[PDB]
Design an enzyme around this catalytic site. Structure first.
Site, mmCIF file in Angstrom:
data_model
loop_
_atom_site.group_PDB
_atom_site.id
_atom_site.type_symbol
_atom_site.label_atom_id
_atom_site.label_comp_id
_atom_site.label_asym_id
_atom_site.label_seq_id
_atom_site.Cartn_x
_atom_site.Cartn_y
_atom_site.Cartn_z
ATOM 1 N N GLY A 29 1.063 -0.910 0.211
ATOM 2 C CA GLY A 29 0.022 -0.258 0.008
ATOM 3 C C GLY A 29 0.669 1.119 0.502
ATOM 4 N N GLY A 31 1.712 3.003 2.900
ATOM 5 C CA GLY A 31 2.799 2.667 3.875
ATOM 6 C C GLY A 31 4.604 2.581 3.719
ATOM 7 C CG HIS A 47 7.226 -3.473 -5.941
ATOM 8 N ND1 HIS A 47 6.253 -2.088 -5.318
ATOM 9 C CD2 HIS A 47 6.827 -3.346 -6.756
ATOM 10 C CE1 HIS A 47 5.809 -1.678 -7.049
ATOM 11 N NE2 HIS A 47 6.568 -2.577 -7.952
ATOM 12 C CE1 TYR A 51 7.867 0.603 -8.980
ATOM 13 C CE2 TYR A 51 6.599 1.364 -7.785
ATOM 14 C CZ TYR A 51 6.735 1.003 -8.742
ATOM 15 O OH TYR A 51 5.761 -0.218 -9.124
ATOM 16 C CG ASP A 89 5.363 -2.019 -11.594
ATOM 17 O OD1 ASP A 89 6.176 -1.950 -10.662
ATOM 18 O OD2 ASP A 89 5.526 -1.379 -12.353
HETATM 19 C C1 LIG Z 1 4.522 1.973 -3.575
HETATM 20 O O1 LIG Z 1 4.383 1.303 -3.088
HETATM 21 C C2 LIG Z 1 3.660 -0.052 -3.574
HETATM 22 C C3 LIG Z 1 4.071 -1.271 -2.946
HETATM 23 O O2 LIG Z 1 5.538 -1.906 -2.818
HETATM 24 C C4 LIG Z 1 3.406 -2.497 -3.570
HETATM 25 C C5 LIG Z 1 1.880 -2.304 -3.925
HETATM 26 C C6 LIG Z 1 1.569 -1.137 -4.037
HETATM 27 C C7 LIG Z 1 2.075 0.239 -3.499
HETATM 28 C C8 LIG Z 1 1.595 1.552 -4.017
HETATM 29 C C9 LIG Z 1 0.694 1.630 -3.945
HETATM 30 N N1 LIG Z 1 -0.110 2.894 -4.089
HETATM 31 O O3 LIG Z 1 -1.004 3.612 -3.423
HETATM 32 O O4 LIG Z 1 1.087 3.752 -3.302
HETATM 33 C C10 LIG Z 1 -0.728 0.521 -4.295
HETATM 34 C C11 LIG Z 1 -1.539 0.365 -5.027
HETATM 35 C C12 LIG Z 1 -2.343 2.122 -5.882
HETATM 36 O O5 LIG Z 1 -2.255 3.311 -5.910
HETATM 37 O O6 LIG Z 1 -4.175 2.213 -5.113
HETATM 38 C C13 LIG Z 1 -2.473 -0.115 -5.770
HETATM 39 C C14 LIG Z 1 -1.767 -1.068 -5.456
HETATM 40 C C15 LIG Z 1 -0.810 -1.819 -5.223
HETATM 41 C C16 LIG Z 1 -0.090 -1.120 -4.383
HETATM 42 O O7 LIG Z 1 -0.926 -2.813 -5.298
HETATM 43 C C17 LIG Z 1 -2.079 -4.056 -5.634
HETATM 44 O O8 LIG Z 1 -2.983 -2.786 -6.098
#
Ligand SMILES: COc1c(O)ccc2c1cc([N+](=O)[O-])c1c(C(=O)O)cc3c(c12)OCO3
Length: 121
Positions: A29, A31, A47, A51, A89
């Site tokens: 998410g 966080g 991940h 990034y 990704d």
């Molecule tokens: C920088 O980080 C993140 C990760 O390391 C891993 C997954 C996500 C992520 C950041 C996301 N957002 O919000 O930052 C996000 C979002 C969203 O935008 O809604 C939707 C998703 C995700 C992620 O996985 C499935 O559907």
């Protein structure tokens, strides 16, 4: 962008990226704190680290393209940023499916406040 990443996730895990992996554990998410709850959460931690090592790019917003060859994801050769974002990704989506056997429903909608402390990549 989240569009391409979400597509990879659905293809690899069979689960809609959102909300299955958008509020999971401490790192799946927005966080990014505390000790990853499990294997799946560690996929997100990694991940994030990936990034985080693309300061010259916009991982969540930059669009890129990829294809599938012999059943496996193949990152198209676009700009340096698009290629690297795609690879970050790809590794995460695959990490998710490789660890689906320990995916726990109890970590869905996990409260951010239970996650504290910076964990070095
Ligand atoms: C920088 O980080 C993140 C990760 O390391 C891993 C997954 C996500 C992520 C950041 C996301 N957002 O919000 O930052 C996000 C979002 C969203 O935008 O809604 C939707 C998703 C995700 C992620 O996985 C499935 O559907």
């Amino acid at each position: 962008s989240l569009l391409e990443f979400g597509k990879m996730i659905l293809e690899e895990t069979g689960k809609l990226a959102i909300p299955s992996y958008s509020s999971y554990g401490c790192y799946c998410g927005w966080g990014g704190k505390g000790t990853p709850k499990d294997a799946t959460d560690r996929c997100c931690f990694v991940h994030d680290c990936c990034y985080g090592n693309l300061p010259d790019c916009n991982p969540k917003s930059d669009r890129y393209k990829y294809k599938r060859v012999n059943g496996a994801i193949v990152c198209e050769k676009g700009t340096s940023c698009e290629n690297r974002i795609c690879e970050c990704d790809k590794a995460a989506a695959i990490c998710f499916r490789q660890n689906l056997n320990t995916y726990s429903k109890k970590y869905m909608l996990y409260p951010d406040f239970l996650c504290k402390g910076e964990l070095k990549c």
